Amino acid sequence: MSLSFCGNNISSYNIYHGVLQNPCFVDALNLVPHVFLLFITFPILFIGW
Amino acid sequence: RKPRIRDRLPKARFIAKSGACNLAHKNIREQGRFLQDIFTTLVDLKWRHTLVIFTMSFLCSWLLFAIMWWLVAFAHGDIYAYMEKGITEKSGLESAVCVT
Amino acid sequence: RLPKARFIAKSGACNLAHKNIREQGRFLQDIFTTLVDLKWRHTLVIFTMSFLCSWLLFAIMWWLVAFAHGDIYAYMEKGITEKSGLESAVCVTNVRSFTSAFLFSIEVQVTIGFGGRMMTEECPLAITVLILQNIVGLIINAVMLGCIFMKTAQAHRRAETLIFSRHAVIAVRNGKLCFMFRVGDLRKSMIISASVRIQVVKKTTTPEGEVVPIHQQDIPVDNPIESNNIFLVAPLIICHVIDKRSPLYDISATDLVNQDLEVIVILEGVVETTGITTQARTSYIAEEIQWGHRFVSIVTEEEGVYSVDYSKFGNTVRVAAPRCSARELDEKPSI
Amino acid sequence: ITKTIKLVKYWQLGWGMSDLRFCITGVMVILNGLLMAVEINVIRVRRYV
Ligand SMILES: Nc1ncnc2c1ncn2[C@@H]1O[C@H](COP(=O)(O)OP(=O)(O)OP(=O)(O)O)[C@@H](O)[C@H]1O
Numbered sequence: 025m026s027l028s029f030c031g032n033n034i035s036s037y038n039i040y041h042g043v044l045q046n047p048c049f050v051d052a053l054n055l056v057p058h059v060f061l062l063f064i065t066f067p068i069l070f071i072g073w
Numbered sequence: 074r075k076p077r078i079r080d081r082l083p084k085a086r087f088i089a090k091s092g093a094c095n096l097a098h099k100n101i102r103e104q105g106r107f108l109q110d111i112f113t114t115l116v117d118l119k120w121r122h123t124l125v126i127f128t129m130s131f132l133c134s135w136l137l138f139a140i141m142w143w144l145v146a147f148a149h150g151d152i153y154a155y156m157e158k159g160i161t162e163k164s165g166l167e168s169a170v171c172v173t
Numbered sequence: 174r175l176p177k178a179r180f181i182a183k184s185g186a187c188n189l190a191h192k193n194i195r196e197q198g199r200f201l202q203d204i205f206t207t208l209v210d211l212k213w214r215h216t217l218v219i220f221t222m223s224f225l226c227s228w229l230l231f232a233i234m235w236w237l238v239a240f241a242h243g244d245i246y247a248y249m250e251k252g253i254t255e256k257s258g259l260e261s262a263v264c265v266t267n268v269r270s271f272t273s274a275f276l277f278s279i280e281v282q283v284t285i286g287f288g289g290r291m292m293t294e295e296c297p298l299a300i301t302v303l304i305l306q307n308i309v310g311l312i313i314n315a316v317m318l319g320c321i322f323m324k325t326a327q328a329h330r331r332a333e334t335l336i337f338s339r340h341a342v343i344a345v346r347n348g349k350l351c352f353m354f355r356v357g358d359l360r361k362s363m364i365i366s367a368s369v370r371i372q373v374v375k376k377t378t379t380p381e382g383e384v385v386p387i388h389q390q391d392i393p394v395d396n397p398i399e400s401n402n403i404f405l406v407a408p409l410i411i412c413h414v415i416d417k418r419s420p421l422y423d424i425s426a427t428d429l430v431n432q433d434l435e436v437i438v439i440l441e442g443v444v445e446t447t448g449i450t451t452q453a454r455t456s457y458i459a460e461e462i463q464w465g466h467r468f469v470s471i472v473t474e475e476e477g478v479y480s481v482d483y484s485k486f487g488n489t490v491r492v493a494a495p496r497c498s499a500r501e502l503d504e505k506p507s508i
Numbered sequence: 509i510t511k512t513i514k515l516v517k518y519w520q521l522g523w524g525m526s527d528l529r530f531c532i533t534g535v536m537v538i539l540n541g542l543l544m545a546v547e548i549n550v551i552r553v554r555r556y557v
């Protein structure tokens with residue numbers, strides 16, 4: 025029942041065969057840049073100049 | 074005082090009875106608002122806003138570096154090594170789970 | 174060629190030499206004072222470098238300690254599974270390589286302390302190193318917290334931003350010669366208990382044959398009760414009546430050009446926003462005083478509230494004023 | 509940069525010439541590029557050293 029970041033099918037996160045050549049890692053890295061933007065933006069726009 | 078009624082604007086009030094300097098500066102050489110200015114606004118906040126910025130900052134830092142750690146424990150082939158339920162954790166010892 | 178240097182540079186910052194001064198040396202108190210007064214772009218570097226160097230040095234010491242007792246030597250030669258290694262006198266459980274010792278440091282000083290790396294009571298050297306590491310960590314942490322807070326505390330103030338007019342005007346007022354300059358403000362908080370002073374500095378002799386190359390001769394700012402204090406919220410014109418008792422009596426526009434002289438204007442007050450004393454200065458040289466150019470009004474009359482401007486700060490309209498002396502000014506008042 | 513990596517991977521697989529998911533990604537890349545352009549232009553246009 026656990027939520028799956030990369031889907032729950034077993035061992036579908038078997039990241040052999042190249043570090044970044046996996047069907048899921050690309051999405052995650054793209055999400056990392058988006059999360060970074062939101063966090064920095066919220067902290068500098070919750071005060072204002 | 075209808076003349077004064079229409080003269081409500083025409084009035085020699087250099088400083089308002091409150092005390093402020095009711096004036097108007099213009100045509101000045103505003104160089105900008107350099108970064109450090111924002112930090113000064115951080116000092117002169119009120120308690121509700123200071124508490125909010127405090128807690129929000131701590132939580133944002135925690136979540137951000139947690140996301141980073143999540144990626145790290147992903148790339149090292151760690152989450153998969155744990156997900157292998159052949160045993161309670163069959164080959165999870167030698168694979169050097171990057172973060173235990 | 175090079176004109177004799179102004180006892181005060183235009184922006185301030187008295188530029189005078191200082192030769193044959195006996196050295197006062199230096200003190201480490203001074204290094205600390207230099208540390209506190211840094212700017213961010215170097216504080217957030219010296220701070221980080223202190224931390225990283227601290228961790229690395231103590232990790233090296235830890236590695237040596239785990240070397241002497243042979244912690245590494247026992248660990249590496251391990252049999253299948255584990256019978257020989259765990260039970261013997263290891264000094265720091267589960268340190269077996271540099272990176273491991275590094276992690277042990279970073280877990281000890283910064284107070285993380287996970288638990289995979291436990292320390293036993295069998296190696297006095299280990300106890301002394303732990304004590305020393307912890308004390309060093311506390312001292313470094315305290316001083317860096319102090320520095321960061323001092324910046325967060327005394328950054329309520331900024332660079333001195335006070336603006337004098339560019340030029341000076343010798344004008345006519347109340348049927349007499351007069352001296353005028355403009356003093357304004359761009360800051361927010363009105364200066365509290367401000368004061369203004371004017372000093373003429375020129376080489377003088379003394380009839381008993383003695384010279385004093387840069388005299389200073391305070392001179393009276395005009396005011397209806399002679400009070401050096403001055404309120405300022407809009408640009409002002411700090412005047413100066415001229416009389417035969419004032420040191421400017423002997424100058425006309427003809428003799429102004431090639432004349433050795435100066436005026437230094439220094440005004441001081443305590444800004445209330447930062448609660449701190451401050452003083453600003455200017456200095457006008459002979460060639461910088463446009464004669465006769467009476468000042469141009471600034472304050473207007475907008476409907477509800479008065480208004481001022483700053484683009485036309487030094488606009489000098491010109492009017493007729495006598496081109497003659499001041500002694501001769503009262504010698505011949507006929508027409 | 510994340511999108512470019514995603515597109516090359518989206519590349520090698522060659523699921524389709526126009527397989528829809530490849531089509532979208534491409535669109536997102538170009539707008540991103542246009543935004544990069546504006547940032548550079550704004551640097552020059554306003555105060556830049
Ligand atoms: N509108 C204004 N905004 C900012 N500063 C001003 C303004 N008007 C005057 N000043 C200050 O007064 C001083 C004398 O200014 P003045 O009216 O002579 O302009 P300027 O010196 O001829 O031209 P600039 O100010 O560009 O050098 C200047 O150092 C300036 O800092």
Ligand SMILES: *[C@H]1O[C@H](CO)[C@@H](O[C@@H]2O[C@H](CO)[C@@H](O)[C@H](O)[C@H]2NC(C)=O)[C@H](O)[C@H]1NC(C)=O
Nearest residue numbers: 030031032033034035036037038039046047048
């Ligand atoms: C998890 O399960 C899926 C199936 O739901 C697997 O993918 C396919 O499964 C078949 C066997 O039924 C295998 O041959 C291949 O792995 C896939 N189909 C092929 C190539 O015929 C796979 O084990 C996991 N999911 C993925 C990534 O396909």
